[PDB]
Each structure stands twice: as C-alpha cells, then as structure tokens.
Design a protein around this nucleic acid. Structure first.
Lengths: 125, 186, 66, 147, 53, 257
RNA sequence: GUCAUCUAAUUAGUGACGCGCAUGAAUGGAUUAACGAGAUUCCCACUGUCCCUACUUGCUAUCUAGCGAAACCACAGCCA
RNA sequence: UUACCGAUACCAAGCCAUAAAAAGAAGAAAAAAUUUUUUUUUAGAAUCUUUUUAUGAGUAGAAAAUCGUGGGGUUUGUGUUGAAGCGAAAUACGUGAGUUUUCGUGGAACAUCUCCCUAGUGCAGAUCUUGGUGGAAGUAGCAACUAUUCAAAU
RNA sequence: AUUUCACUCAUAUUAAAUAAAAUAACUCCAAGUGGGCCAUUUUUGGUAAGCAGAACUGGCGAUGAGGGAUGCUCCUAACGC
RNA sequence: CCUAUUAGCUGGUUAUUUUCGAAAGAUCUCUCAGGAUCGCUGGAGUUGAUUAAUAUAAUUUUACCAGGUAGAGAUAAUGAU
RNA sequence: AUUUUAAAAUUAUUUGAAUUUUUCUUCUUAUAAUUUAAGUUGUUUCUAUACAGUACUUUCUUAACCCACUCGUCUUGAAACACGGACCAAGGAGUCUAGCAAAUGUGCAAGUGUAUAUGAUUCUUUAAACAUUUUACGCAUAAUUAAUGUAAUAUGUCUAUUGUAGAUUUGUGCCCCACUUUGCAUACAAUACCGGUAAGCAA
RNA sequence: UAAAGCUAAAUAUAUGUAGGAGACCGAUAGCAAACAAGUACCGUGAGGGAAAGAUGAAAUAGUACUCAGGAAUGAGCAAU
C-alpha cells in the first residue's frame, strides 16, 4: 500500500522481485522483465508478481529526499563539503564507505560547524 | 476505453532539436527561436526552423542563382540558411547584400570585390530583427544525386530512377528490360 | 501438407489502416499521346502568343530604357 | 563503437530481433546473386532492369589512353583565368585572351552555356564541338586547333 | 539479395585470410630507407648519390 | 590478436546422437581427462572465442587535413582564453593573462631547478604542486602492462628554438614541450579537453602569425591555407538581444496558462 | 476346395481329384535307400505339462556388525 | 414491481510518465524574541523553468532514455586510523535495472557520474562446456567354485 | 483551345449535414510477417463432424479485468499508481 | 588433414523503463517447412496545418447512375411436369 | 515579486431609478470591509517536558481472508498425457573485414581526397604528430550510342526558357485581412536543345 | 632481334634465434603447456593428449613443552 509521512508519499514499498526467484536459487530476486510466450506475469494474470510500471513513480516535488526531508550527498573529504554551505538545510551529508577514521572525524566536525546533518555519523567508532 | 486515433496523442513529424553540437550554431538557434517566439515574424519562425534542418535540406546556393533571385529587388538582402558557393560560369557580380550560414572563400572574395558584403545570422538579427527588406532564399533541395535514385523503382514503367550499378558501359545493366530487342523495355 | 489456398480476411482492415488513398488530381495532365494535329496546333498558338507578348514587352522595355 | 550497436539493445529478448517464427537461418534464399531469373526475379526486374543478356560488340583490348579526352564547356573559358584579368580583357576592346585549354587539362570544348556578348576570345584545343565553334565565332573569337 | 542495392560483387570466394596483409610498418620503413640513403651519401664522401637522367 | 588457430588444434568429432550427450564435438581417445570433453566452440572450455580477434581490424583512422588544421587552430584559440583554461583543470588564478608569453631566454635555461623557479615566479606554484602530488599508482590491470602511474597534464611549453629548454623543462611531472612548427593536437587538447595552459616563447608567439598566413614566408607558412571562418560574427547573443533595435521589435511579454 | 482316412469332435496330418489366381523339366522335372541339434502329423511308453496344487533342500532375500554404489529427478505426488 | 450487490469499464480528486500546448534570457516575505536581534528562504540550468489539457494493453518488430562490466585518455580523488572482494543487513534512494551506506570478514590496492574513447561488456535454459554437490540411500548390493571347528602365539 | 483585359458568383455560419478533420500529405531506410484459427450471418462438398473449402464484419493470436462454477474465441468491458 | 565443409531443418540466443506496433493476404518461383516482391510496421525528414477552414472522411443528405441476388413465374420464353 | 487581480457575492453607510411593493426586491453612485470570490483553515489535547522502550519507523518470521497450475519453446491452440530443465558456480552466442547505399554530424566546395613516396635539430612516448617549388590518381564537374563517334536555348543579351500554385519581400486600405509587388524550394505541365532510333530530303 | 648464360638493390618472411613494445589475456582466460608440458596417461599403430600457480615480511620464525592416547590425533595454564 501507499506510505505517507508528512508531504512525502511513497506510492509502493516491498520492491518488485523477479518471477520464480522464490523457488529457484539460480534466479536472483533482482527484477527482470519476463519475455516468455505464456508467462503468467507478462500476461498479468491476477495474483502473481505484478511488474513495475511508470505509474508507481513518486512525485517530482518530493522525489529524492530522505525521511529527514532533504537530499543526500556523499562526500569523500572535507573539500567536497563546500557547496553545502549554501544549502545546509536542503542537503544532508553521507561519508563514503572507503573513508578512514582519520578523515571521518574531520568531516564530522566540519559538518557540525557547517550546520549540516550527517547520515552515518557514528560509523567506525 | 476511448476510441481515438493514435490513442489521443497528437503526432508531429520532423526535427524537434538541432542535432549538431556546434556551439555557435546552438547559440544561433537559441537566439533565433527566441526571436521567433517573441516577435510575430513568420520570417523569424522560418529561419529558426531552417537552422534546425539536416545538411541535405540546406543545400548550397550559387552566386548565379543568388544574383538571379535578387535581380528585381536590388536594395534588399538575400537571406539563405545554406552556404553560398562561387559560380565560375558567372561573368560578373553586382553589389550583393547577402546573409548566409557559410560563404565559400571564392564566393566571399567575389562579393567583397563586387562591393556587396557577406553577413552572418547574428548580424542579420542585429540589423533586421523582423526581416524588413530581406528575401528568404534556398538552393535546390531535390537536385542532389541521391534523389535521382528515389521515386518509382528503376524498372517500373516510365521510371526515371537512376539504378545502382558498378559502372555504365554497354555491358552493365543495359540488355534485358532496357530495350525492346531483349524481352521488354522498362 | 495442404495449404490454405486463399482468403481475403483482414485485407480490408489492412487497406483502411492507412486509409483508402485517393489520387493526387493534379491540375495539368501530360498530353504526350492525345489528339495530335490539335496539340501541335496548340503549340503553335502558344508560340505565337509568347512571340507577340514578348515583343510588346521588349518594345516597352526599349522605349522605357532609351 | 560496439556499444552503439543495435544488437546490444536486444540483449535479453531471446530472438535477437530476428523473429520467433521465421528465425535467422543461414542463406535461406541462396548465396550471392543466386536466385536471379528464378525466385529473386522480381527484385532483379524492379531494381536492375537490364541486368541479364548482352548487347554490342567486343573491344578486345581497350587502351583507354587512346580515347581519353576531358571536356570543358563553353561557359567556363572566361572563368578559367583570374578575375582581374577578366576585368582587364573586358574593358579593353583591342585585345583578346588566348586560352590553351589543353594546358589546363581539357581536350574537347563543348558548347553548353553563354559567352559574353561582343567579347572576343581565342581558344586552343584538340577538339571542338560544332556549337562551341559557332558560339566562339559569334562572340567574335576564333577556335585554334592544336595537338 | 533484397531491396534497392547494387548487385554484390565481392571477390572473396577463395581463402583470403591467407593473403590479407596490413602495413603496420609503413613509417618505420620510411625511416629506414631515409637512414640508408643518408648513410650512403655520407659514405660516398660528398659525391651526390643521385644520377643525372 | 589471439593465436590464429587457438582452440581449434584438436581432432574434430561430434559423435553425439544416441549417446545421450550434447551434439558438441568431443576430443577422441581415452586414458586422459581431456578425452571426451567438449571441443572447440565458444561455449566450451578451451574452445576458442566467438569471433577471434584479427590483426586486420581498422586500427588507425584517416582524418582530413583541413579538419586537423581546424582542430589545431581551435585548440590554440581555446588555450587563449582564461575561462576555458581554468575549467580544463589548471590552477591559473595567479596568472596575469592566459595567453602568457615569456622572453626568448626561456629557450636557453638548462636546469630543472631554474625552470621550476621560473614556473613558480610566474604564479604557477599551485599548478606545480598539483602536478607533483598527482603522481599515483593507477587502478586495474593496466599497471601489470607497463602502465603503472597516472599523472595529470600541466603547462605545455611551446618553443621556437631549443637551447636547453627541452632538457630543462622535462623531468617535471606533467610538463611537456612542443616546437611551434610541429605543434600537436594530441598535446594541445589532452583527452579531447578544451583549453590547455600554454606558455609561449616570444619568438614562437610571433612565428604563429607567419605560420598561419600573415606575413607569408616560403618554407614556414602553411601554403594556401585559410584560417577557418566563424558562422557568427559575434557570439554575444544576449548583447545583441538587449540591443535597442531588437528590443523595439519584440512585442509585449505574454503570460502562461 | 471336394471325396476318403485319422478323432468324439480335425482351418491340422495323410491318400486321392485337378480348366493349376500363378506347377513343370540342368530357373532342372519325378522318385529315392542312407544321413539330419532341419520342418510337420499320429501312436506306444513316460511323466506335476495339466486336473490342483502340497511338502521339502541349497543359495539369496530378511535382521545385525562392517562396507557401500547407480539409473532417475521442472516442482512434486489421494481421488470423482 | 422495487431495493440491493457487483469490474482493471464510467465519474470526481491526487500523483507518474507520454504527447501537445500557454509562456519565460530580478525584487523582500513571513515567523519568533526585544525600535534591535534570531530562523527559513530571497529562484532563472532553453533536451531548462512554471503552468494547462488529453492520453496510458500489447507477441513478432522498431526506437529513445536510462543501469551496469574489462580497459584508455582527461579531471579529482579514496586507501595499514584497512582497498578490492565476500556474508548479513538499511527508519536509505530509485519505478527499475541498480546506487549508496552499516556491521562482520578481509589485508592491498581502488574509483572517477567532469567529459569522451574502446570492447572478448550483462544468462535460467542450448540432452550447453568445465568443475563441484545432492535426493535416491546407509538403499541395491558385498550369492559360482560343498566347510569349517578347537586351542595357542603375535 | 490557349492568352490578356474587363464585370461578378453565398463567405457577416462557411455554394447540404456532421466531424478531439492537419493525429495531414509526401519522401527515404529498414524490421517482422507471408502455417492461422474462432463467432454471427451467407454458402460449396459431405450422411454428418470440434470435417474440408470460401464471403462480410468482429475477435482469438498479440490480451489481461468482472461474469458464464470450469474454459484461448461467449456477455460486459479492454489495462499507469 | 581439406574443415569451424554445407544445412530452405531442430535447439539456444544474456539489464531496466518508456513510446509506436504487425502479419498469417497477394504475385512470381523445381515453389508448398523456403525466398523475392507488394501489403501491414517503426525510425528519420521535409512540405503543410496551426486561421472552430480547406485539404480530408469504412458517415449521412440531395441529385443521378449500374445491377438481376432474395423473392415471383410456369398460363412470359427454354427446360421439365 | 507587476491577474489569489479584476469583477462576483455579502455586510455597513450612500446616489437615482425600476418593479413583481420589499426585514435575502432588483439595477448603479460612491466609500470601507469581508468571502459565498481567489483548490483548508482554526482550537484543544497527545506524542512529551524523551533521547530509543512495551511507544513510533523499518526489516524478518509466522498466521489469517481473497487470489494464485512449471518455466523456456515450437505452435491457431501448452498447466499439458508436447520437448529441455536434479542443484550450484564460472564460461556461453549478430562480431570483424571488404564493398555499396541511406541517414545524420563535420570540413571544404566545382571541386574534393594528398595515394605511394619524400623532408625534417621528431625519434621513450614518436608505429604519431608536422609538411608537400605556382596538369600524378580516384570520385565529381555531361550525356548518349553496339559503334566510327557526336555532345546540351544562342550572340539577339553579364539577358540567366514559359506557365499555374507557392515561401519571403514591397506599398494602400507598429498589432487583421483584401488589393498590388516580388515569385525561393517544390509539384504539375509546356517548351527548346544534346545523344540514339524512326520518317522526309540527301553532293 | 627467339631458339645460350650471369647479375646487386628496392620485395617477402604463421620458421629458428635475439632484442623492444602493446587501449591484448590474467590460471575454465592467454600457446596444448605460467608448474617435472608435448609431460602423465591412452591406442598394435598412424596418432590422441591432460590436470596442476598464491603460507608468511621473515620459516636464517614451518609449530618447542605438558597432558591424554598403541598410534593417528586432540587439548592446554604452553608456544612462533
């Protein structure tokens, strides 16, 4: 069903799974459109693995923003934080996975004094 | 369910945006469709449309045809979206005021010596934004060789389509179906 | 095996999918093989008309250009 | 530019765009120009009318150097020489240009076009069309035959 | 054959991969020839290596 | 290219109908692991690739001489403007002017120390630092193919005479030189990028005009070559829009639905 | 096929008959003692072939210690 | 004769996309404290921005835009304060291929989406190839050659 | 018959009506296809056939949804969330 | 080994969304499991329309045409009876 | 941030008129406010006077109601008593070259391409880049004929064939259209002229 | 100017040897063979023909000692 928090409405949860991936190990759950001929899912038989459509698209006014109602931006050092100084209340910052504890403390403190929220603030400590 | 042609969506044909990634041509297109939108000028609308066209639809125009088309009105400006090429068959030029996308080196020199001048489309927008005293011209679009193969297939009755052959000797596609002596002709 | 020899089924639908095209109906038809000794005379008429018209226009041009 | 190829966009489509019923067999109509006059006859007659048969006599060894002759038409002689020299031959009625067309690389002078009225011009060439001669003499020039 | 195309004419009905060869060494050969003739004219002690024709 | 017969150097046999096995060719014999295994075929292990790479691929390309000359001219022009050189990646915020030219004695210096000192004194200390600290071992299998490091591109020193400049400015990472007579597009636009920080000697700068048509000389000027002409006289599109002649032509601003 | 015989009963066997679909003479015809792991019918003897099955012996099966595969396998396994 | 139930069809409204359209190359608003402070914004990317309406099945087939992989130029980055990879995950984003993060493991490299170049570039099947592993199953079976037993030593 | 001059034949609703009529017309390149089948109505052969062969239109194929308990083709109705 | 011979025949032919969307007729064919060629389809592009018109229409009206199926007939012809 | 304006309605005054004759009668005259205009705003509680729980968000696992036949494939028709598939990993199939065309982008343009090769203080890269003493060759610039061959208005004019539509331009009734003016592209024709063939003449 | 003869260069080199490179492959790939590879092994023979790389910086740190076991091994308060 639809999920609605604040103004952000997510039109569908529980991401689509590939047909028959439940009962075949070689078939990964990642969605693939089934070509088939008599394919059930392709023909849209009721009660079987509905396919993604453009109609599920979230509205463009609130498309990419996180539950904190702002867009995420992934940074790798303190230098890539400069553009956030202007839109600190529209963007949250996430530190890249391959950033060391050297630099993570620096990015955390810089974002703190920049007044921009950090997503994975308590990582690697 | 509703019964509409094309499921109710209007379909247009032809170019929508310029394919050329030429920065100067992109600037020209921006300026001229701004002019077309803002002014009422069908002149500007046509220029904006023609700046968008493929290369085969902005063919070169010779100085001979330029002079011939501008013969009756001598004080106006010939605006051609293609390029202007020099015609060696022409003996003498006379005082031509022409705006064009590109000018051949020879055509340019001939025009300057004749005393006219070569104009670009930004200058044309600067001086004649609406298009007063500007005659819109274009070269022969159907004159190119590729068009000689189009139309009815070569082999249809009364077809003037030029076939695709290696060469055009007597022994190349000239015997059966091209003369009464061998079965039929065309 | 036996083949379905013939059917006109779906042919009308195919025909009407791009409509029943009408002939273009141009204004002038070529006179290549029609009424000789008449269209030849028409050629002579037209030649004379152009001769007289062009000679009048040339007279006017000469008398206006001195 | 293998990433722009159309086959890439049929990557998961089974038939690779070649049909489910007809399939993509290998040479299902024959090889090369096989079926002419038999089952590709409609193609041959519609796009290459006079293909089959032979006409004319045989030239055993040709030696195209014997009959090679480029042609220049009568309306390009004045354009052969530069513009200021056109001007200088134009205003002066006592001199005419002598153009050795053979030297520029044409052997025959053809008669299409229009020479300038009352502008004499002498042309040297190996061959002349009769109408080319008539036009050159009409403008007061002369055709000189050279080899 | 199909559609309006020139009739095919390719003379590749024999084993042509054996005879294919590509000149990867055109400019290398140019340099080698220039070096050889330069060494020739250096060896013959000021006499030009060209002959009058 | 792969070895010509690779994967097909075995005895061919596909006895496979009625054997309850796939009809793929199998190697003959017995007494070894390979006997009976799937023979050549792109799907088989050790079977040879689908379309073996051949040396007669179209490696090179033929480029029109006029187009190459146009590209070189455009690269020089692009190097002549500050914004493009800045956007390319160079740190030229302390340069006095983008088409910077230095006295011909730059062609005579012969020590990398004084070359670096001159480069710094021009204000390219940041550029030199970028080039120096950019040296880095690259990612991937390239570094096992004699392609270990990856450097950025710095200033291109264009000179007319070599009195030591070539053996003075090399060995500085990211710096390359070019004689003005043989200037190369592969150096002028590295990676197809627009605008390269170019440092000209005075003589090379002056000889550019000789090369490209002005003050013609017999064995220097590119014979009967004409500099390309723009299709617009002035690309200041919004200036010509704000000109009062066309402002009077524009009618009243309308409104959306 | 018809007539005899064989039986109680004979699409079988044997002896005859012959306008023989379509027999026949070294494409060999007719007949033949002896011979045959050749085809066929009948009789005597014989017997679990059978009426009509029963009991019994060895080796397995079976349970255990040890050892220990394979074919087959879309997913699986009640019916009207 | 009434009432009711009953669709992915119909109607009203929202949102996605497609198509078409109308139009466009610069200035302060509010709130909370107390005249002065504080907090949000204060926009202008033309394949763009704002707004409007209609429409949305689809095999064979075609096209566009996207998402990934090996390698190459350009740019600018990440790594012993632990890279790639891998297992489980996530108040995560996307419609979706995917992307990005956390923890654990790992112990030496990795990315570049700034733009572009390149290809041996994307698997569920082909009695596909190679390798590994199952249920069958502690099952079938370990049945020719008459036969073993007592005591002792090691 | 052609050409040139004249005069003028509704158009303010448009030389009858109606028309999400320009979503048109044309040109180029090219894919797939070229085994079909069913329903109503008509019809040939056949005793007849879920038979063989045809005509019109609509469908199934290529297509799900509600109903006909069940059902490729029936009725309703065709599909973004 | 030529040889990865040939196969009009069987099997397979690898990411997502969006948009458009078929044919199983026809002509010729040593053709009937194939092909070429029309038709149907996509993409590209131009000319047009953008002016509640004109072009246009699987529609009707008005005017005018052509027909010999259903029906009717056997005393109208032929053939029956 | 120059239409959530204007008006429309309502209220309170005000001007005149009308009329169904008046406590919602109507029409304007002005003013000022409202919303019934000009797509939801307010109040009060709780979350809660917390820093992560028994609440809230989310994943997973289980149920429950309704629904749901193995996919791939050939086929008119497959869940089929049609074939392939025991399972998993890795590999696995429209590519390369020649030649032609169309399309589009780019450069130059009656020219275009510098082929082979040469030179040159270039020689890690560099097997690439750079260059080419003012009728080499390809394609195009002219066609037609088996062919000897012949070869495109025609010197009255440096005008440049003729029509009907037609883009653009010019004026008269800077924002409509009707008349003029010009007449691109293109379409449909007509004319000339070139090559070949007929026919007539033919030193 | 045939029926006699010689002759360098420009030319070619899927061989051998030796160098140098690469937008090549990265152990099911790349040669069949990264290794003791035309080896093991198979066939009377002509011939057929594999699989198989990685401790760690250093084994000049490759597991000492104790306990339990016949031993393999296991465990440790012991150990690189």
């Amino acid at each position: 069903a639809v999920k609605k928090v604040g103004k952000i409405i997510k039109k569908r949860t529980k991401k689509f799974t590939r047909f028959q991936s439940n009962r075949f190990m070689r078939v990964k759950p990642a969605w693939r459109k089934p070509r088939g001929i008599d394919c059930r899912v392709r023909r849209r038989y009721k009660g079987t693995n509905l396919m993604p459509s453009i109609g599920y698209g979230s509205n463009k006014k609130t498309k990419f923003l996180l539950p904190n109602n702002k867009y995420k931006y992934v940074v790798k050092n303190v230098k890539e934080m400069e553009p956030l100084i202007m839109n600190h209340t529209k963007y949250c910052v996430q530190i890249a996975h391959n950033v060391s504890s050297k630099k993570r403390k620096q990015i955390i403190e810089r974002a703190k004094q920049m007044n921009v929220s950090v997503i994975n603030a308590k990582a690697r400590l | 369910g509703i019964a509409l042609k094309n499921v109710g969506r209007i379909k247009k044909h032809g170019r929508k945006h310029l394919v050329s990634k030429n920065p100067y041509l992109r600037l020209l297109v921006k300026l001229y469709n701004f002019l077309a939108r803002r002014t009422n000028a069908n002149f500007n609308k046509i220029i904006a449309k023609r700046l968008i066209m493929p290369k085969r639809y902005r063919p070169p125009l010779s100085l001979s045809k330029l002079q011939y088309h501008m013969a009756n009105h001598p004080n106006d400006i010939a605006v051609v979206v293609g390029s202007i090429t020099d015609d060696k068959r022409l003996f003498s030029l006379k005082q031509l005021k022409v705006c064009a996308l590109r000018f051949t080196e020879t055509a340019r020199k001939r025009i300057e010596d004749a005393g006219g001048e070569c104009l670009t489309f930004d200058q044309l927008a600067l001086k004649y934004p609406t298009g007063k005293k500007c005659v819109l011209l274009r070269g022969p679009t159907k004159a190119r060789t590729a068009e000689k193969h189009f139309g009815k297939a070569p082999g249809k009755p009364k077809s003037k389509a030029r076939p695709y052959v290696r060469s055009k000797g007597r022994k190349f596609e000239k015997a059966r179906g091209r003369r009464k002596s061998r079965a039929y002709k065309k | 095996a036996k083949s379905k020899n013939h059917t006109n089924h779906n042919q009308n639908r195919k025909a009407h999918k791009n409509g029943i095209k009408k002939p273009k109906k141009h204004k002038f038809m070529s006179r290549k093989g029609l009424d000789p000794n008449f269209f030849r005379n028409q050629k002579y008429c037209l030649k004379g008309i152009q001769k007289k018209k062009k000679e009048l226009k040339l007279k006017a041009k000469q008398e206006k250009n001195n | 530019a293998t990433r722009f190829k159309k086959n890439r966009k049929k990557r998961g489509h089974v038939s690779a765009g070649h049909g489910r019923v007809g399939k993509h067999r290998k040479h299902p109509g024959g090889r090369g120009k096989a079926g002419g006059l038999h089952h590709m006859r409609i193609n041959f007659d519609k796009y290459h009318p006079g293909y089959f048969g032979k006409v004319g006599m045989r030239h055993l060894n040709l030696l195209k150097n014997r009959t090679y002759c480029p042609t220049i038409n009568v309306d390009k002689l004045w354009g052969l020489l530069p513009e200021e020299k056109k001007k200088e031959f134009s205003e002066n009625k006592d001199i005419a240009p002598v153009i050795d067309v053979t030297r520029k690389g044409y052997f025959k002078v053809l008669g299409n076009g229009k020479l300038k009225h009352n502008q004499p011009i002498v042309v040297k060439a190996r061959y002349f069309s009769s109408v080319a001669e008539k036009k050159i003499k009409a403008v007061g020039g002369q055709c000189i035959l050279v080899a | 054959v199909a559609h309006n195309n020139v009739l095919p004419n390719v003379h590749l009905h024999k084993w042509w991969q054996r005879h294919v060869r590509v000149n990867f060494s055109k400019n290398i050969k140019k340099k080698k020839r220039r070096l050889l003739r330069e060494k020739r004219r250096k060896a013959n002690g000021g006499t030009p290596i060209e002959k009058l024709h | 290219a792969v070895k010509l017969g690779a994967g097909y150097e075995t005895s061919a046999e596909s006895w496979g109908t009625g054997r309850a096995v796939a009809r793929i060719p199998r190697v003959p014999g017995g007494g070894t692991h390979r006997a009976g295994q799937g023979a050549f075929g792109n799907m088989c292990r050790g079977g040879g690739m689908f379309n073996p790479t051949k040396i007669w691929r179209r490696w090179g390309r033929k480029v029109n001489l006029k187009e190459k000359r146009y590209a070189v001219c455009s690269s020089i022009a692009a190097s002549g403007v500050t914004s493009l050189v800045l956007a390319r990646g160079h740190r030229i915020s302390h340069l006095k002017e983008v088409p910077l030219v230095v006295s011909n004695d730059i062609e005579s210096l012969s020590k990398t120390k004084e070359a670096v000192n001159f480069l710094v004194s021009l204000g390219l200390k940041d550029e030199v630092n970028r080039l120096v600290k950019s040296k880095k071992i690259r990612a991937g299998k390239g570094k096992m193919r004699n392609r270990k490091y990856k450097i950025r591109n710095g200033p291109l020193i264009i000179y007319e005479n070599d009195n030591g400049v070539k053996k003075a400015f090399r060995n500085i990472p990211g710096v390359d030189l070019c004689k003005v007579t043989k200037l190369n597009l592969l150096k002028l636009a590295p990676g197809g990028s627009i605008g390269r920080l170019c440092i000209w000697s005075e003589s090379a700068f002056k000889k550019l005009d000789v090369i490209y048509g002005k003050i013609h000389e017999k064995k220097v000027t590119k014979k009967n070559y004409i500099l390309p002409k723009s299709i617009v006289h002035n690309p200041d599109i919004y200036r010509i829009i704000h000109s009062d002649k066309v402002q009077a032509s524009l009618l009243a601003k309308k409104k959306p639905c």
